[PDB]
Amino acid sequence: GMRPALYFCGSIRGGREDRTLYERIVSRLRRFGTVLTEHVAAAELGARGAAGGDRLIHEQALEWLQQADVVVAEVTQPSLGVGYELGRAVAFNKRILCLFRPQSGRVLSAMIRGAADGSRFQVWDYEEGEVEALLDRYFEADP
Amino acid sequence: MRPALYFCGSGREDRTLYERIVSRLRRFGTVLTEHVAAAELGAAAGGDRLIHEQALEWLQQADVVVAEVTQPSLGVGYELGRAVAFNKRILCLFRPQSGRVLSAMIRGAADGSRFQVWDYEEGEVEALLDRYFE
Ligand SMILES: [Cl-]
Ligand SMILES: [Cl-]
Ligand SMILES: [Cl-]
Ligand SMILES: [Cl-]
Numbered sequence A: 001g002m003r004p005a006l007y008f009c010g011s012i013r014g015g016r017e018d019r020t021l022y023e024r025i026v027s028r029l030r031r032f033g034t035v036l037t038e039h040v041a042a043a044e045l046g047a048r049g050a051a052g053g054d055r056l057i058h059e060q061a062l063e064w065l066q067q068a069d070v071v072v073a074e075v076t077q078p079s080l081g082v083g084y085e086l087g088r089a090v091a092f093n094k095r096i097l098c099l100f101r102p103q104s105g106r107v108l109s110a111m112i113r114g115a116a117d118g119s120r121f122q123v124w125d126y127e128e129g130e131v132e133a134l135l136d137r138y139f140e141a142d143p
Numbered sequence B: 001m002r003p004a005l006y007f008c009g010s011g012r013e014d015r016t017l018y019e020r021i022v023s024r025l026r027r028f029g030t031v032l033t034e035h036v037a038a039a040e041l042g043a044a045a046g047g048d049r050l051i052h053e054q055a056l057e058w059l060q061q062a063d064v065v066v067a068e069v070t071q072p073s074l075g076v077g078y079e080l081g082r083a084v085a086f087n088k089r090i091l092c093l094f095r096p097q098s099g100r101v102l103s104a105m106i107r108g109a110a111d112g113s114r115f116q117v118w119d120y121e122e123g124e125v126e127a128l129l130d131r132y133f134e
């Protein structure tokens, strides 16, 4: 409770550059609170993550998601898991920030774009090189 | 009245499979999907917001949610997330022959009962639906 609890959702399926962005976002998020992710759950479970391993990852991640004060998601790469975390987050009435790169050529899911209300659920477009500045802008106004 | 079924889905194999699944689900109930919401649009600003609110209403009304989860999709995941919170019975369908490893968050959502994740090969999808729904 000392610090805001932040939960981050993102995909790394696109390779090294996706991993670097993932780490860049999580690193800047730490400025503004404690950060938990599905990667942290999978890292802690190690070998047990195995038969039934995905169930333990899911239960641990959902437990952290439910406790979060803000849920941040990078929604550029299509991802069932990121969509699912967002859907659970909405039903937990979490404040949500989604980050999208229009550079990707992609059209953001209508279901995700359609969930934004401008305040409690927001979708921010960004380019390579400004995600740290935008995260600052978001959290320096709404810790 | 009839059981209300909500189908979540996203390539030739993919389109024909979507069509096959929706067709077979009609044997058990009426079927609504996100594409039916989008087709409601002819025009636009606020258009995605309308799709979202319409799909959410149909999802909340559904007796069973069925999702094809072979292709990565933020929408299908979002729908599943909302359906879990709506305490809905959920059936996900995954094709291992895709070469992909299903998302841990989806595979791990399964509890064997109200949330089930079934691997399948394309030729047997109608038979699996028959098994679930009869
Ligand atoms: Cl890369
Ligand atoms: Cl995925
Ligand atoms: Cl809109
Ligand atoms: Cl209607």
Ligand SMILES: [Cl-]
Pocket: A077, A078, A079, A109, B072, B073, B074, B075
């Ligand atoms: Cl998507």
Ligand SMILES: [Cl-]
Pocket: A091, B081, B082, B083, B085, B086
């Ligand atoms: Cl919901």
Ligand SMILES: [Cl-]
Pocket: B110, B111, B112, B113, B115, B116, B117, B118
């Ligand atoms: Cl199962």
Ligand SMILES: [Cl-]
Pocket: B095, B097, B098, B120, B121, B122, B123
């Ligand atoms: Cl197949």
